[model samples]
Target chain A: KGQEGSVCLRSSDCASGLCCARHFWSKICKPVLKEGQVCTKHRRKGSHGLEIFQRCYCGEGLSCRIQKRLHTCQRH
Target chain B: ADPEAFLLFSRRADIRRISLETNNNNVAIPLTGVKEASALDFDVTDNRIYWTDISLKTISRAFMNGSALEHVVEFGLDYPEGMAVDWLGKNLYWADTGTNRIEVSKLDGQHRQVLVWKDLDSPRALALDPAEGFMYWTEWGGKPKIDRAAMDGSERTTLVPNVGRANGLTIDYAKRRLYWTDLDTNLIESSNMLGLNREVIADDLPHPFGLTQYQDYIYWTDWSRRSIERANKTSGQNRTIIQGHLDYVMDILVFHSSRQSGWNECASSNGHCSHLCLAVPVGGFVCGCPAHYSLNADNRTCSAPTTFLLFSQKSAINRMVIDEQQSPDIILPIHSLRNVRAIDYDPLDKQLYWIDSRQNMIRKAQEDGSQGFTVVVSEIQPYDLSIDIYSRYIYWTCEATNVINVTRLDGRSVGVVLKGEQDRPRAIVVNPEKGYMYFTNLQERSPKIERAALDGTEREVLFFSGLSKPIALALDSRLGKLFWADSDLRRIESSDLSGANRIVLEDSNILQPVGLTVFENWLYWIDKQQQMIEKIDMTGREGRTKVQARIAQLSDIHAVKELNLQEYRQHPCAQDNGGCSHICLVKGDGTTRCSCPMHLVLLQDELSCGEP
Candidate 1:
């Protein structure tokens, strides 16, 4: 299966300590993420209403969760 | 021409066979089979067929009749690629691509020895000259080169370079003619064995794979057409001798009576042969046991082990500088920076500093590369910089700001100490005793040599001339003279600090002189146009160019490996191609001895020698 912005599925694909991260809207592989991170799904408030996300991010204060109601969320 | 002679090998097939086709005849005789044979050799004296097999991973030999398949030597070959027979010694020489080593063994594979394997990478093909006892080979891995060594594998020398992807090689010993295939260009090129007289013999082959010579014709195998072809040794009258193979053809060799006789006679006289010479039918060739040299009554196989050091190209290094002290060391390749313009060294702190015009920054490193480097100054376009070791201060001219700045050696306490309406202040020098900073400023409106105190006070114009652009300035403390290179006049002129006793040191035609430094009796500066570092005597007598300072043609000279050698050859005063971009130490006699950026250690002989 092909990921939208990922060149590979894991970190070992890169030579050094780098990762394949997505660009804002294009399919590009950039070295992002602070050292370590895992891929997951999340939702955020969008201009229309709510937005779904499929990507990887690093650092604390960031987590992945699913939401059915506009304001209610359940951790995955 | 002997139309019956043919050499055959395959790169992908595990087996290699040698075949002979007679004139006006279609019958072909399979002389031998070698496992994983990518290269072949035919010795005429004994009618012996030798080939390198990829499957067997060893060199094997058989009589012309195709009987007695035997292994002579195996040294854990890493893709053994090329082979040649030394008739005089009855030894087989071959190149091992995996380990970058060349080795030779007798027909029986006894007394195996390694030839030159020093600093070589991906050695491809070999050609032996029995008369002079020299062997030549091509390196395909880097900076495609042709190199040679003595028959016993001593005194390896680089002959030609910059030809990309040298694949197959052959030599005409009598005429001193050497030819090779350029795999990328699909051209056959020839040069004298000593590396002179280079010429392209043929172009646009369908991927000419291997090359061999017999009499007046040069034979080659082409993988694209699956055919064996021949042309005049000079590449005239090309014709196909064989075509339409089931697999790709790789290499070719010629079988002749003299080649076999030379091999057998040498093997017998050397007492390296194990079996009596015997004549066999076309299909029943005699094969000697492993570690035994085979001499066919019609062809002789003898054992003689030889060693060779392989040579590889070093990646292109920019600027190098050598230390000035006795037993001088070298510093190299301040990597990743371009247009290195100026280099200065501090003996007390053992540090080297350089100005990189391309990066618009100043950098510092340890002389031995033991400690990492740090950028001392950034965000400025510095043309020239100097370091006063005793005072622990670094000074430089900034063309961007039109001012001279001073800072601590560690990049602290930096400020624009001297600012003026100066136009393109290019050269800067520091005199610790006088506590003065002298600089050259070249502007169409005002061209002048100016001096100020270390604190940027007491500004004074020492000399002003509207006609000349003063490119470099150096202060000789012992002689109390300030020397400057005048680019407009193409000459080096000097005057005392008090601006008296002005005189011309030399009238040599130079283009864009830069980076002036003095050591005792001589003055050294970089000549940008000539790509050379030149010097003149202080008394303005006995002036001449010095060795160890001229930057050889970059295209021809690739990857200088000697740490000290490269350092001493650096031009410390030029920006053209970043010639003088590192700290170089010059002797009192005006010879540059060593160079580096101050943070890299010298590579020892043990580490610098031998193939990687």
Candidate 2:
């Protein structure tokens, strides 16, 4: 729904009609994060007491982090 | 045993208390400045007395023996009279003859609820017991009867149907009995909890009004005597306990140690309450939980969190409220709308998001059927629906199109995340907090469970075998588990999100189960073939077994979920400041830098820009 580099990997995943490219390892379908929007910069083990295979995929300039018992995507 | 203490609402703008000791010292006026104090109750744990003033149309409270009075429910009350406190549940209840209704609420006057609306007339008195898990009251609705019901107002029945002006009522839950006074009969009567063993304890009382119980003795107010009194609970031995020529006496209560202080954290069932125990101000206990938890008969122990069953019955979406042994209908406006095959609840907005598979449509509405009947989006063959409150997005799987897609709550910004011929995707769930979306793929290739990144990358098939057309899915984030029901196998199963540590929860006694969800460790589901909603034990702590029961039944149910609270505070603005510049507004919605002050134009960055 935005510019290229959004949190996706496949071309079908983006509404913008742009093919996804690699920023880190996975891929952004296309479209970067809107300003003041959550964006992923890196992936790490979930700090949440629970486990899920993938860490958050934030916007191109953002990373996944924790604050007050919740997982939030923030810009570095 | 004599009373340790007692209290009275004397009409002289005051609430007074006295020691139950043999000394029976002078009555102390702890609170004043109240007018026409029509009825009163003592929250033994709160160390306060709550009373109603008919003239002022207000409900007020004060310290057990202090003069600081504060109004609780001030606005929608008229001729307010009887009041009581369920200190065990940290709840307050009352009856207003002028309003012709009985209401229940928390001590803070929050969560106010009306117990009787249509079938009630001139309610005179109210009593509560978390111990027995019921509320007792005297009402002149018809034939001046005494009545009782579950604290939440269900299972209402007349305890004493025939009466002459029933004035006051109270329950001796400890002794498993009930008591009340009648103004017309000029008598105080006692009976077993169900009104089976009726005994007139005081036959010669003038205008007997308010009542209460302290162990072996029964207490009441004699409106004609301007006094408070008591008698042997079972023997009916008459005794005037506090009769010093007072003004019109209304209601009375005893300060027995039996009255709960507040909430206490339960390690287990030892000296602790089962589920929803809460800690109070003075290191005591108050038995209470959210609207969903069904309290145990003891009022102290809680059975489990109630799960709301939402299913599609032909053209309409139906909702059933299940708490313990009872399930009741909650109405929604989707009745005329047909073929609603899938549904999901938004905890942030307390609204519902549903898919009408027949019409290729999705709509949103408030839980109480107000403010919204907004049709959000429409697509080809929308099958199963799920919501991500934190990310402000809605996801659905379309079988006809063989794809999964995403859209904002407002139905904007559409995105198709996945499409594959490998299988037909049904039953979608998302854990946006972990940036993963999941669904069950049913096909000739065999049943498979799959998950991917939020935008549909890193696709992995978590589990591929031991499944048979699993139609629905649920996630227990707190327990790190995923549960589902297999339509072909007629059973429920769970595994780690990674498809490890798989176990069968309920193996038999299921007729093609479909929708499945978890609440407070209980797994609930629906049978598409049987058309009934049911639940199973989540944990197999015992040997091979199927712990299941019918919660509700309808035409053709397709889904279920524990209507838990979340959507409100789950907004992105709630935690990360919505990644905004200055103002991040969270109204059960995603937070983002929305607006700026003055003539500053919003920049393309959308968060911050030049002050032009």
Lowest summed lDDT over 10 consecutive residues: which window, candidate 1 chain B?
Answer: B304-313
Docking class of 2: incorrect
User: Whole-model lDDT for model 2 versus the true structure?
Assistant: 0.62
Total clashing pairs for each candidate: 72, 31
lDDT of 2 by residue, B252-366 (tens): 6766656543232322242354434433333344455433345667766554333465655545565655545443342354333556566677755667676665566877776
Every candidate's lDDT:
0.56, 0.62
Top lDDT prediction, candidate number? 2
**Per-candidate interface DockQ score:** 0.01, 0.01
Candidate 2's chain A scores what TM-score?
0.32
Off by over 4 Å in 1: A1-76, B1-220, B223-331, B366-372, B377-379, B421-424, B546-612
